[PDB]
Design a binder for this molecule. Structure first.
Ligand SMILES: Nc1ncnc2c1ncn2[C@@H]1O[C@@H]2COP(=O)(O)O[C@H]3[C@@H](O)[C@H](n4cnc5c(N)ncnc54)O[C@@H]3COP(=O)(O)O[C@H]2[C@H]1O
Lengths: 70, 71
């Protein structure tokens, strides 16, 4: 698998924009599924509680990010 | 999530930075496969001749990118 899904269930990251997010490693947000819509994420895209994040990167950082976010 | 592969066959864009690419649409480069390895693309990342660009986004702009990069 190369596309992983992570739930954004951490209140500490609400309204935090991708351009300021402190990534656990080399990761790109491929899509964010929010309110039944699939968004192509960019720098000023803000995380929201309940977001379904579709991410790609090495399993390590993905796992790392997963722990912090959900 | 649809991903599309685009070959970087246009020397016009070689060495150009992702932060400096003129995007005319809603698109993200999910992966670049370069020198037999699969890499995660960022702002500094350069397009290099022969790159296999894996992209996601508005299909209309994917199509324009394919014109620019591999036609
Ligand atoms: N995979 C990709 N596909 C297409 N273009 C790409 C790209 N990765 C980087 N870029 C382009 O480079 C900018 C520079 O990227 P950078 O990684 O330095 O700087 C970024 C980055 O760390 C964060 N960001 C934006 N989108 C992101 C994403 N999908 N995943 C992770 N971080 C993102 O916001 C900073 C400013 O974002 P902004 O989009 O307004 O500005 C973008 C975008 O035009």
């Amino acid at each position: 698998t190369s596309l992983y899904e992570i739930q954004m269930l951490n209140y500490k990251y609400e309204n935090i924009q991708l351009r300021n997010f402190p990534f656990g490693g080399d990761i790109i947000f491929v899509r964010i599924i929010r309110n039944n819509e699939s968004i192509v994420p960019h720098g000023d895209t803000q995380l929201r509680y309940g977001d379904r994040l579709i991410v790609t990167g090495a399993k390590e950082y993905v796992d790392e990010l997963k722990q912090e976010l959900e």
